[model samples]
Target chain A: MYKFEIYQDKAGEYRFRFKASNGETMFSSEGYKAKASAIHAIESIKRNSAGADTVDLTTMTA
Target chain B: MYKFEIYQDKAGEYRFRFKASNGETMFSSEGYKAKASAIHAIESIKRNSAGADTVDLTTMTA
Candidate 1:
């Protein structure tokens, strides 16, 4: 199942990951200074990610 | 421009954010146990994210 997981980093900071059902991590979030912020991030993503536009960067060449 | 940004979290674990041209973060990743792991995560995302399918969880009713 898809999941939003939160955990503490080595520095004891809160962080989260959005994982696909297949156990692939599709997205990640920045380290939050607080656990509440990390939870907020997950909520924001759930609210905003739907129908979010995708931009491709692979085709660009220097 | 799309970019992969890697940094250390408060726990000193390496993390990353994928940002769009407007500097909006499109996605983020879980904290890595090591910096090299974080880099590998970015490479995995680059190799996998493009053309990936999307799943809509909002339609489900609990």
Candidate 2:
């Protein structure tokens, strides 16, 4: 139904991006300094992979 | 204070990703089917480029 992809960032951090069955980028994840940190995020999925957290990154505009 | 980059995805969408002075992906954006739509997003930056909006992509975890 979905897929999780993990990769190393140019910044030398671990990050993940997800895609749905249709092959669309559902969303991106918070980058981690370590690969383990990346797993922790995905691990949450297996533990309860049903829901996700969206952090509003938008900022206050003028 | 920041730089905005426009690119087309393999899936064929105009998307924008931003970076700050230090060169980090501050956040990603809502992809547009058209370049004009992409421009609107960037314009929103200049219209009040001071504040940005972030949409949390994380989901409910275990």
Candidate 3:
């Protein structure tokens, strides 16, 4: 099953990652000031991910 | 703005991460066999993340 793993990082902030069944992390979150905010981040991603646009920076030029 | 960043790993597989405007990783994807697949993964996440059920293992008991 897909899993959302939340934990405290070395910096002592809350963070999360989504792990695939194969035990590979599909993605991760930045440190948050609160655990609830971390959870909010997850939900926000779910709510906002659909229709979220993509930007390809590799083609960008200075 | 949220952005999707794709890159090739040391193993030569394509991987991606979703980053917030502040430059923090919001989530990432497992290495994909093809760049197209990696892009597909991002789209899949967008499609699937809405109302996506989250599994929290911290409460699990052996």
Clashes per model (N, Cα, C within 3 A):
4, 21, 3
Encode model 3's per-residue lDDT on A10-52: one tens digit a residue.
6765667665545566555553456776776676566566556
DockQ category of candidate 3: acceptable
lDDT of 1 by residue, B4-62 (tens): 65666566555565554465664456645566666555544444344334332323233
Comparing only chain B with the true structure, the TM-scores of all models are 0.73, 0.68, 0.68
The TM-score that candidate 2 achieves is 0.40
Worst 10 residues of 2 chain B by lDDT: B48-57
TM-scores, all candidates, are 0.48, 0.40, 0.55
What DockQ, between 0 and 1, does each candidate earn?
A: 0.11, 0.04, 0.30
The regions of model 1 sitting more than 4 angstroms off are A1-27, A30-62, B57-59
Candidate 1 vs candidate 3: which has greater TM-score?
A: 3
Q: Pick the candidate with the highest TM-score.
A: 3
Give the Å shift of residue B31 in candidate 3.
2.9
What is the Å distance of residue B43 in model 1 from its true position? 1.3
- Give the DockQ ranking, best first: 3, 1, 2
Off by over 4 Å in 2: A1-62, B51-62
